[PDB]
mmCIF file of N, CA, C and O and ligand atoms in Angstrom:
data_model
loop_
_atom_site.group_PDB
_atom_site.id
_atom_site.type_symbol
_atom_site.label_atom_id
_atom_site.label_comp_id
_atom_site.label_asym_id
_atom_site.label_seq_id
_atom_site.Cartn_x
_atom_site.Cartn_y
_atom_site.Cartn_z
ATOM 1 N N UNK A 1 -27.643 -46.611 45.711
ATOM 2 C CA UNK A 1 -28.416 -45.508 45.094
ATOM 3 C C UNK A 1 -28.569 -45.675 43.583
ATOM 4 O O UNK A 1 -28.421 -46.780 43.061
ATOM 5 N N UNK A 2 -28.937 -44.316 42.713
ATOM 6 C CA UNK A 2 -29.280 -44.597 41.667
ATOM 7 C C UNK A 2 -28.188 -45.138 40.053
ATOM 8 O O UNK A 2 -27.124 -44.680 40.470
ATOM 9 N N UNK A 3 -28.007 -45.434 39.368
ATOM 10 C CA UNK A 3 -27.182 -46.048 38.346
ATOM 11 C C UNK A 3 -26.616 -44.758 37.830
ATOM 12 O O UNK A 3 -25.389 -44.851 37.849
ATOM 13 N N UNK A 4 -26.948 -43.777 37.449
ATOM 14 C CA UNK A 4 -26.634 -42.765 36.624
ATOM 15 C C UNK A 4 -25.387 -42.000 36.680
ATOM 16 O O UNK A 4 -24.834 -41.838 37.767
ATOM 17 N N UNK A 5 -24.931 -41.547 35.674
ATOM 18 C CA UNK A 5 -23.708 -41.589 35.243
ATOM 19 C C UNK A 5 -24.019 -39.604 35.405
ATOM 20 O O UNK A 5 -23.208 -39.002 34.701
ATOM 21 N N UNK A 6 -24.709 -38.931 35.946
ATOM 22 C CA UNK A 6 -24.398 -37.461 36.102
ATOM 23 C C UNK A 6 -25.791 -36.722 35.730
ATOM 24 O O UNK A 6 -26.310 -36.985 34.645
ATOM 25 N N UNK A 7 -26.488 -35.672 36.739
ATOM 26 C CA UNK A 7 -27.542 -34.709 36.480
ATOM 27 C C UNK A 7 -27.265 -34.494 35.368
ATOM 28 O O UNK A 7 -27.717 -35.330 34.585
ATOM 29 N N UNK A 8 -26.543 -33.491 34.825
ATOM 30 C CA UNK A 8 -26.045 -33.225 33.159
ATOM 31 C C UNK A 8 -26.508 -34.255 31.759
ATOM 32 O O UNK A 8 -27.116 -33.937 30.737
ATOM 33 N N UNK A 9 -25.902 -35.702 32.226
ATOM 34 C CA UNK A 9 -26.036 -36.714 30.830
ATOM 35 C C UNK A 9 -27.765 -36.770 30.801
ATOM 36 O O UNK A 9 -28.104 -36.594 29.630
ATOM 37 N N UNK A 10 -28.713 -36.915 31.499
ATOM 38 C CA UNK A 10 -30.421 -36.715 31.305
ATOM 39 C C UNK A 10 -30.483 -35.508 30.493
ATOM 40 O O UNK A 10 -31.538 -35.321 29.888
ATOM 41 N N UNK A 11 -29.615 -34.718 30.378
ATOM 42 C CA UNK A 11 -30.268 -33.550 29.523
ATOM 43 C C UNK A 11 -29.572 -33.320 28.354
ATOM 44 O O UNK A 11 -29.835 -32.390 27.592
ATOM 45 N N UNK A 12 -28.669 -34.150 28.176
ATOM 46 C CA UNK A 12 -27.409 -34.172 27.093
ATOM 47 C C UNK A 12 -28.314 -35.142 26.125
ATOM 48 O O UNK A 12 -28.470 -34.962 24.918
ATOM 49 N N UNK A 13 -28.883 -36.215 26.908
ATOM 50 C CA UNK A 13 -29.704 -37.219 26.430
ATOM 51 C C UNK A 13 -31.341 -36.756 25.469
ATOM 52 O O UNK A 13 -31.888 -37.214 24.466
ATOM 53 N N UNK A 14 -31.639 -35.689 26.389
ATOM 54 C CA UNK A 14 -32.740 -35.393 25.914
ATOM 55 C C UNK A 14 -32.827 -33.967 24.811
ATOM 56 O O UNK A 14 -33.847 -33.494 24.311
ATOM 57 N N UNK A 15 -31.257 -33.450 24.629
ATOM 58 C CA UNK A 15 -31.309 -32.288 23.943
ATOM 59 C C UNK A 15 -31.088 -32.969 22.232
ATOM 60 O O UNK A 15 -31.421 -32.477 21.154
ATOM 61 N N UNK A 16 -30.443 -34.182 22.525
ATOM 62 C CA UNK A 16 -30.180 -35.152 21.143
ATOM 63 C C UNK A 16 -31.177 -35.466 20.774
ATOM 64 O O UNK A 16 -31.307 -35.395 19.552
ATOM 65 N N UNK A 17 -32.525 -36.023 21.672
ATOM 66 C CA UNK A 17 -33.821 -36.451 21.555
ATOM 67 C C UNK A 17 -34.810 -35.223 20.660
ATOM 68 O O UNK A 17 -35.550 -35.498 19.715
ATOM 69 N N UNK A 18 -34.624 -34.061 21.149
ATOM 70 C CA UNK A 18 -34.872 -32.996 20.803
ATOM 71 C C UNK A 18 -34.032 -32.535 19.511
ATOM 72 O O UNK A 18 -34.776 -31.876 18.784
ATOM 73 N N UNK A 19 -33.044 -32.626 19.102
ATOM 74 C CA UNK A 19 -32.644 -31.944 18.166
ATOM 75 C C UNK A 19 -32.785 -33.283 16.837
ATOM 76 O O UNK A 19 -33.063 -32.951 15.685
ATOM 77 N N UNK A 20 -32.567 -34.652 17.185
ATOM 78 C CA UNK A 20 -33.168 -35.761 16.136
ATOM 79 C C UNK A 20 -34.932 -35.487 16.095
ATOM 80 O O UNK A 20 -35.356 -35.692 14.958
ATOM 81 N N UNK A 21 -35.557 -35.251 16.660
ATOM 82 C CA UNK A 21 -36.970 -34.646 16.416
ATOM 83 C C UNK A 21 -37.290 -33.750 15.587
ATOM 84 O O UNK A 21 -38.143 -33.986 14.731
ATOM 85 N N UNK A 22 -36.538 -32.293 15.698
ATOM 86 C CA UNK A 22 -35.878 -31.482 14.357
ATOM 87 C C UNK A 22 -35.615 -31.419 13.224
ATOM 88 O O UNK A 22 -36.124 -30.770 12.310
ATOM 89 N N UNK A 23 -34.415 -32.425 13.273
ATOM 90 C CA UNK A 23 -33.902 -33.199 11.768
ATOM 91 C C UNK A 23 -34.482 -34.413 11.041
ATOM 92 O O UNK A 23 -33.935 -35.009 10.113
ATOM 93 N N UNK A 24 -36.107 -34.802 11.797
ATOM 94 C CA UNK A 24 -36.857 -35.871 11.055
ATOM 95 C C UNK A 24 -36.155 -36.915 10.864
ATOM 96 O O UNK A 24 -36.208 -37.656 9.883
ATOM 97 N N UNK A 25 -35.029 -37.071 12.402
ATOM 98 C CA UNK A 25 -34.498 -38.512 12.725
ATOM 99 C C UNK A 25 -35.089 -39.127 13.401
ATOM 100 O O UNK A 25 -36.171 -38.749 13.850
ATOM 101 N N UNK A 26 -34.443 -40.492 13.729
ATOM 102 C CA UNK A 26 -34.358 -40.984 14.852
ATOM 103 C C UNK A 26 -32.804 -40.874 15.831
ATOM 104 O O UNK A 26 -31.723 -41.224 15.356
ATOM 105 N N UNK A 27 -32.973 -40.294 17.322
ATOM 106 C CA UNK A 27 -32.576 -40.270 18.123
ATOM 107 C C UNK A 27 -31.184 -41.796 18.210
ATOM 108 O O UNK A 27 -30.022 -41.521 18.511
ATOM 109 N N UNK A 28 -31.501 -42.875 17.980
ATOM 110 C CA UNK A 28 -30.803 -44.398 18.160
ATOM 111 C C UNK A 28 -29.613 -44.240 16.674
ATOM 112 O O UNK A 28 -28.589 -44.923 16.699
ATOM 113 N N UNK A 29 -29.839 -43.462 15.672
ATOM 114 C CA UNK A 29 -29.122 -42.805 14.884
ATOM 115 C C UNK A 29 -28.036 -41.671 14.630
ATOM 116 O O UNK A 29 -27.031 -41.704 13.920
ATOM 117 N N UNK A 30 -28.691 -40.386 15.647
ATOM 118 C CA UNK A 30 -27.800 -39.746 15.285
ATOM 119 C C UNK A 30 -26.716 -40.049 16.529
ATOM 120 O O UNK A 30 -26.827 -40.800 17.498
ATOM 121 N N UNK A 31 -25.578 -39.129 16.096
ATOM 122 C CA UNK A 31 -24.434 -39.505 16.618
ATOM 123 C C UNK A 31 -23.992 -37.698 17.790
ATOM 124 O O UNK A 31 -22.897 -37.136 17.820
ATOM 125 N N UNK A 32 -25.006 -37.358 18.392
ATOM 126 C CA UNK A 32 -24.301 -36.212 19.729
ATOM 127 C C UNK A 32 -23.157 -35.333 20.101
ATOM 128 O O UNK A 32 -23.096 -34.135 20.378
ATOM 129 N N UNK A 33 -22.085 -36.477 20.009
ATOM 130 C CA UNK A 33 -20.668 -35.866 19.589
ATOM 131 C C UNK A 33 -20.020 -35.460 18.492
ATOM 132 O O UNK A 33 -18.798 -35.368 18.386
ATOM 133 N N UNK A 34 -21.298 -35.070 17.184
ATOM 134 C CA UNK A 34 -20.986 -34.722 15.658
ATOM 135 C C UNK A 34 -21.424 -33.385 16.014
ATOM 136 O O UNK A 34 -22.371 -33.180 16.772
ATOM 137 N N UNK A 35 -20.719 -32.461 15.453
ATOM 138 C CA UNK A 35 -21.364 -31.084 15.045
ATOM 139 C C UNK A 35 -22.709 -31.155 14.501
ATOM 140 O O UNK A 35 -23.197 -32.158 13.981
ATOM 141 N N UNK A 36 -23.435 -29.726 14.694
ATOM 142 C CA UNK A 36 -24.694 -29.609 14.477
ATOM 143 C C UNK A 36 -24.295 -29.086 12.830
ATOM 144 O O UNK A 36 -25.404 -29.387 12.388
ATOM 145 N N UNK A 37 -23.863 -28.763 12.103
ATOM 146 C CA UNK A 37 -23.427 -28.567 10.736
ATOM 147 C C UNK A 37 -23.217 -29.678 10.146
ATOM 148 O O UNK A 37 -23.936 -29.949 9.185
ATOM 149 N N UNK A 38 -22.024 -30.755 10.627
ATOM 150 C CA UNK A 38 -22.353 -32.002 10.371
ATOM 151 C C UNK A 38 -23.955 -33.000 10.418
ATOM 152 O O UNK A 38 -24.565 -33.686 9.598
ATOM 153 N N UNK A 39 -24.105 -32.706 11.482
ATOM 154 C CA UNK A 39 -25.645 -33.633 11.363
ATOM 155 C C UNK A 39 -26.709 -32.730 10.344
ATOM 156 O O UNK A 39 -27.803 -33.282 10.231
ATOM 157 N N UNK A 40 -26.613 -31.841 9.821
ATOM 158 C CA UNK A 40 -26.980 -31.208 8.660
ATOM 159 C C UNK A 40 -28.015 -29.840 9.239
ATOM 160 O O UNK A 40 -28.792 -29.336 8.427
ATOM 161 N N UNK A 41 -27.968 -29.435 10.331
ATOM 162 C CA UNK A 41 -28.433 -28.375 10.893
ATOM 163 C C UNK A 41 -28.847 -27.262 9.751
ATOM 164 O O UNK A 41 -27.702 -27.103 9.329
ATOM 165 N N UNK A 42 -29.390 -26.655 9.196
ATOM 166 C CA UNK A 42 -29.732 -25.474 8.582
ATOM 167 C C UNK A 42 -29.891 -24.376 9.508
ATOM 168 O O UNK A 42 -30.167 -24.564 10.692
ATOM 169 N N UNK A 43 -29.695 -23.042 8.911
ATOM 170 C CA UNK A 43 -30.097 -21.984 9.733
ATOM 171 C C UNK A 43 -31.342 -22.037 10.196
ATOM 172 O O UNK A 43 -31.466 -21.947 11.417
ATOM 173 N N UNK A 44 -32.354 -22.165 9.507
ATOM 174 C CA UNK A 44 -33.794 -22.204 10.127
ATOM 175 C C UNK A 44 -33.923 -23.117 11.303
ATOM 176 O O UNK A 44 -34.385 -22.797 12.398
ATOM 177 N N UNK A 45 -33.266 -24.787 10.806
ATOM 178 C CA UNK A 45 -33.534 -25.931 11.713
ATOM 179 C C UNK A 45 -32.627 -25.165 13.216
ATOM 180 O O UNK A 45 -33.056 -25.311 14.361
ATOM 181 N N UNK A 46 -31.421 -24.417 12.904
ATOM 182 C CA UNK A 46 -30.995 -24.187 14.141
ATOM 183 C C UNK A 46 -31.818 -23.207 15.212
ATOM 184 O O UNK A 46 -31.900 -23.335 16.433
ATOM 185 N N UNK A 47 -32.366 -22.245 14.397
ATOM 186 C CA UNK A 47 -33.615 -21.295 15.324
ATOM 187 C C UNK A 47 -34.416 -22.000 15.939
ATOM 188 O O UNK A 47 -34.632 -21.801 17.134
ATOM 189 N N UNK A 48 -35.217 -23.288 15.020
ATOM 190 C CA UNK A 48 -36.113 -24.330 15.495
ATOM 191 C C UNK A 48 -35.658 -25.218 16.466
ATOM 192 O O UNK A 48 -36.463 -25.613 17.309
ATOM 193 N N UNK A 49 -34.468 -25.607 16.490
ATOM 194 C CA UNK A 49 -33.667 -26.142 17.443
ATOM 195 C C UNK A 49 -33.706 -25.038 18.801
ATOM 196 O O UNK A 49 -34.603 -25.230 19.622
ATOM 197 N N UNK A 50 -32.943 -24.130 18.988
ATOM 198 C CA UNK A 50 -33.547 -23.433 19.861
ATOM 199 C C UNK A 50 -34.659 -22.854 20.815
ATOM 200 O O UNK A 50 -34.809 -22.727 22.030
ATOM 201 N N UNK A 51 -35.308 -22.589 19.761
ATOM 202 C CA UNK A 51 -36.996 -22.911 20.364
ATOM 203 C C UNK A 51 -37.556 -23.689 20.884
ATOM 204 O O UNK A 51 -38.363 -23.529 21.801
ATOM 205 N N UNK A 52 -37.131 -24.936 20.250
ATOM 206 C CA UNK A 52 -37.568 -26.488 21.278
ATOM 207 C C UNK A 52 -36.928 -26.312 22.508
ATOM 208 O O UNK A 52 -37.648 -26.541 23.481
ATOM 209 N N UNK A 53 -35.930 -26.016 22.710
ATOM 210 C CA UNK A 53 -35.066 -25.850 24.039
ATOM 211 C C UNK A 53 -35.983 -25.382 24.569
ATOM 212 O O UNK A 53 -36.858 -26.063 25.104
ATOM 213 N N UNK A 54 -35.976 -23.780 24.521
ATOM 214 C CA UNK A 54 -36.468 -22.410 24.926
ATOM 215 C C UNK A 54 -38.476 -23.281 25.408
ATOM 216 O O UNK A 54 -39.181 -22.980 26.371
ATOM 217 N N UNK A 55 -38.738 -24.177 24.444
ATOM 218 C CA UNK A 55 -39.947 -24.581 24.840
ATOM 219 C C UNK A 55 -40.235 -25.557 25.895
ATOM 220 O O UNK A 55 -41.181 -25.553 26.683
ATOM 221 N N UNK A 56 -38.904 -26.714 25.745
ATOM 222 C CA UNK A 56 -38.322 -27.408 26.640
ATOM 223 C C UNK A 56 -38.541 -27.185 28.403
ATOM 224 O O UNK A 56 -39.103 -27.766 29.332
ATOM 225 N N UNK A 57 -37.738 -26.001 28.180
ATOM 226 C CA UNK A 57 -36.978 -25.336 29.774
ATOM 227 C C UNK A 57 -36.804 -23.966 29.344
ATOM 228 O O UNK A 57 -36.419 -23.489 28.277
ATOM 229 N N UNK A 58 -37.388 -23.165 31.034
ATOM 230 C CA UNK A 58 -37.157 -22.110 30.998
ATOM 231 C C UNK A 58 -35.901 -21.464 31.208
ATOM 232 O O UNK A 58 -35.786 -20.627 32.104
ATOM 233 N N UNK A 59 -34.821 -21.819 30.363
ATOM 234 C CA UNK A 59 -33.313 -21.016 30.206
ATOM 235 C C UNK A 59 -33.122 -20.055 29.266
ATOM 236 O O UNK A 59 -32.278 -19.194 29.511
ATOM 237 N N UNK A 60 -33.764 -20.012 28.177
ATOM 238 C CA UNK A 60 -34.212 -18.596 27.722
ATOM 239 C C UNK A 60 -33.006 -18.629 26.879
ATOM 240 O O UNK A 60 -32.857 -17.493 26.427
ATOM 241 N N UNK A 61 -32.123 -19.379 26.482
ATOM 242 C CA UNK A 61 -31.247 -19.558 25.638
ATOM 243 C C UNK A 61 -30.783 -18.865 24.558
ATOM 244 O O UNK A 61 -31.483 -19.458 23.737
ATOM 245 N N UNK A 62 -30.067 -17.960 23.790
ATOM 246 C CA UNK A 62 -30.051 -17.736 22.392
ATOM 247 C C UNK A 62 -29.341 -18.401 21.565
ATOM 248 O O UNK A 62 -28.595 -19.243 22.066
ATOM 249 N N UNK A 63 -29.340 -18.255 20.152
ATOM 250 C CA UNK A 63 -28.852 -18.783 19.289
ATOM 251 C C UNK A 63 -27.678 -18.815 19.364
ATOM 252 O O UNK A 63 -27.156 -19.929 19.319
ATOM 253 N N UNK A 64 -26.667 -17.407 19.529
ATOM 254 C CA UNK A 64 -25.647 -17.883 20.051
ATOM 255 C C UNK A 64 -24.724 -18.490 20.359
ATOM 256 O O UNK A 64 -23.543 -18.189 20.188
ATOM 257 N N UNK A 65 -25.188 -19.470 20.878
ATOM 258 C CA UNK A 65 -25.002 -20.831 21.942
ATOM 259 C C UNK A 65 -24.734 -21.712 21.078
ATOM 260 O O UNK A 65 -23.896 -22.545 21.422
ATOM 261 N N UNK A 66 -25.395 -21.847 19.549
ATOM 262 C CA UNK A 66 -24.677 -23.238 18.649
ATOM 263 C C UNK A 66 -23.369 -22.581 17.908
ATOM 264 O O UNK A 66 -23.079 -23.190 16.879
ATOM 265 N N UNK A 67 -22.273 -21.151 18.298
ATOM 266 C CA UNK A 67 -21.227 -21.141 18.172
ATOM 267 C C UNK A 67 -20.348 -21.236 19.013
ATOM 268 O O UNK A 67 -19.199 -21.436 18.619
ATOM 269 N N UNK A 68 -20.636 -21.118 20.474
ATOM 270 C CA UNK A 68 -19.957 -21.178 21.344
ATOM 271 C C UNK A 68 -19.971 -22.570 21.786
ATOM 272 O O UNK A 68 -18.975 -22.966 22.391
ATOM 273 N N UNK A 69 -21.147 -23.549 21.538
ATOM 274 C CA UNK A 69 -20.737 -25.473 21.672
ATOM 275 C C UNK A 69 -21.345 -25.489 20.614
ATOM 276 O O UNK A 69 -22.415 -24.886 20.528
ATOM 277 N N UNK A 70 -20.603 -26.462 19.112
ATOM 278 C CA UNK A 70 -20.462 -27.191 18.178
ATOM 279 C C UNK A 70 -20.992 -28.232 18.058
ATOM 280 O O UNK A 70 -20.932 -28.739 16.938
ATOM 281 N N UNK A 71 -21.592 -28.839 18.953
ATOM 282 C CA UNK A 71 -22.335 -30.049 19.250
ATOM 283 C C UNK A 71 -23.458 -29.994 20.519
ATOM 284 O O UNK A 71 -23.238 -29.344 21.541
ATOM 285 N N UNK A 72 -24.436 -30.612 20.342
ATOM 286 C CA UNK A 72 -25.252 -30.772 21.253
ATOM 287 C C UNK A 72 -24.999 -31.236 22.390
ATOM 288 O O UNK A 72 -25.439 -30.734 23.424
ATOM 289 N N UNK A 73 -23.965 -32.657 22.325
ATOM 290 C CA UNK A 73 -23.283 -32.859 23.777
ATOM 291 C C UNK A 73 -22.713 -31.902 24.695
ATOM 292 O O UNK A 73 -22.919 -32.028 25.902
ATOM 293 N N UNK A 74 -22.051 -31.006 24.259
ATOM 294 C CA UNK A 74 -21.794 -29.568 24.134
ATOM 295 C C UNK A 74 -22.477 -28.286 24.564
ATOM 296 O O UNK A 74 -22.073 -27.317 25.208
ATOM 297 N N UNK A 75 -23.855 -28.642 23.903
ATOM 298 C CA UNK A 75 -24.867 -27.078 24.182
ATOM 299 C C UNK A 75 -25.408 -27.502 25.369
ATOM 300 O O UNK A 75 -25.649 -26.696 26.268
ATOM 301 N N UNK A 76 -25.738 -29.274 25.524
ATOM 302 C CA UNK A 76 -26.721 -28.751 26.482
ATOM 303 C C UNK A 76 -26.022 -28.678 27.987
ATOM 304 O O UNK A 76 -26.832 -28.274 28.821
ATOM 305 N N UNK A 77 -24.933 -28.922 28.439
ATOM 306 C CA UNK A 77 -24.307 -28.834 29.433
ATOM 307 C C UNK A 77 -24.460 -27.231 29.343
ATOM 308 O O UNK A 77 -24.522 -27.059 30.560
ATOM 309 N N UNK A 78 -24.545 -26.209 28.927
ATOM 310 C CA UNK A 78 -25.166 -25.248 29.206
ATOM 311 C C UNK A 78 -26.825 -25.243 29.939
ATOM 312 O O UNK A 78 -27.263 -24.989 31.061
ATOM 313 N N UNK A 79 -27.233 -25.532 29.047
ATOM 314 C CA UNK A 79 -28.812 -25.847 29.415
ATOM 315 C C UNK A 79 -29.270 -26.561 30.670
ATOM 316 O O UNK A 79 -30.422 -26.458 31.092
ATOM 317 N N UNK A 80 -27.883 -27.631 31.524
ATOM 318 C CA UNK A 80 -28.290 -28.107 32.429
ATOM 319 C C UNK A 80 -27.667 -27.299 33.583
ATOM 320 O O UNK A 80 -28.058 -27.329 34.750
ATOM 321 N N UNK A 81 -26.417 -26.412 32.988
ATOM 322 C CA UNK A 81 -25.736 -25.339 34.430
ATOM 323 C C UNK A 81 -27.191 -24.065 34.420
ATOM 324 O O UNK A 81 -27.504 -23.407 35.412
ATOM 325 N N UNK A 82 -27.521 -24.024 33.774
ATOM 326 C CA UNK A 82 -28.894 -22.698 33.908
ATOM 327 C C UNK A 82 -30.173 -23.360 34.522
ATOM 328 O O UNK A 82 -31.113 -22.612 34.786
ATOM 329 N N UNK A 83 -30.287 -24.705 34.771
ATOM 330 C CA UNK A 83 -30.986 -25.529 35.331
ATOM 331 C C UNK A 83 -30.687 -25.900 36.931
ATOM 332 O O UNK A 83 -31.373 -26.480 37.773
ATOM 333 N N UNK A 84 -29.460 -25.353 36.969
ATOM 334 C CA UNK A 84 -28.612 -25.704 38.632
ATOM 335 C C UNK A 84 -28.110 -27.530 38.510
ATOM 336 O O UNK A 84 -27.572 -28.099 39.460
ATOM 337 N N UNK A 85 -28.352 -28.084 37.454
ATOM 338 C CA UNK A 85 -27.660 -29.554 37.337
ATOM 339 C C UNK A 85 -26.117 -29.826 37.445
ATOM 340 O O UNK A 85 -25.684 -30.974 37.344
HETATM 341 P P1 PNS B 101 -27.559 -19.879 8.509
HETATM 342 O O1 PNS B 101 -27.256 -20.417 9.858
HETATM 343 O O2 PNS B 101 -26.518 -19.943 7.456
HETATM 344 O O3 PNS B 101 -28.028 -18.363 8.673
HETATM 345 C C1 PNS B 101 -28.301 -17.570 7.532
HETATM 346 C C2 PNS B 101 -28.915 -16.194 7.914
HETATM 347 C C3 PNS B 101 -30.259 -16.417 8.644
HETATM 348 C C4 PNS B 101 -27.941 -15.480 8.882
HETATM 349 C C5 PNS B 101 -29.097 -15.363 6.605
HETATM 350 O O4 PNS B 101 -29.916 -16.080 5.663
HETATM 351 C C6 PNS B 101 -29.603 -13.908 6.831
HETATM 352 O O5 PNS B 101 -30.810 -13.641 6.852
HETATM 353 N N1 PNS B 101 -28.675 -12.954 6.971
HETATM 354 C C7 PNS B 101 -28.943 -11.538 7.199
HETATM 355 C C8 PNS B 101 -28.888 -10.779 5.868
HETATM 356 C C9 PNS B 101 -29.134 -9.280 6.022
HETATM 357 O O6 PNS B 101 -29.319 -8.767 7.128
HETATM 358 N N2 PNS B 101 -29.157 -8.504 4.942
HETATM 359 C C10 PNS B 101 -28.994 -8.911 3.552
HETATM 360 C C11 PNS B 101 -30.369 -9.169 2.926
HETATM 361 S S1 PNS B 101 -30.148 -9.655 1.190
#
């Protein structure tokens, strides 16, 4: 069957993709398992961060959510249990 390492890591993958899109990175750069304060998150970029989600997938997410996971590796394993992943 297929290679993949878990439903969850595709969206862990693509919330980094999404949040280096944000921060006017590249994705092959940033580092996932860094805090979103560390990777230099601003309040605004974090609303905007959200919204991409929220635009993403319909999980309807709030802000919230970047105090309760510290990292994106982190948030989006939320984003993929509201997905049924
Ligand atoms: P960032 O993640 O540090 O967030 C900053 C903030 C958006 C919470 C902040 O700039 C803000 O607007 N706080 C609310 C301030 C308020 O309600 N009253 C004081 C107005 S001077």
């Amino acid at each position: 069957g297929p290679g993949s390492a878990g439903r969850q890591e595709e969206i862990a993958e693509e919330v980094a993709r999404l949040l280096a899109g944000v921060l006017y990175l590249e994705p092959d750069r940033l580092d996932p398992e860094e805090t979103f304060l560390t990777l230099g998150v601003d309040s605004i970029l974090g609303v905007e961060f959200v919204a991409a989600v929220n635009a993403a997938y319909p999980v309807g997410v709030k802000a919230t959510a970047l105090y309760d996971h510290p990292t994106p590796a982190a948030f989006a394993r939320h984003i993929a249990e509201s997905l049924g992943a």
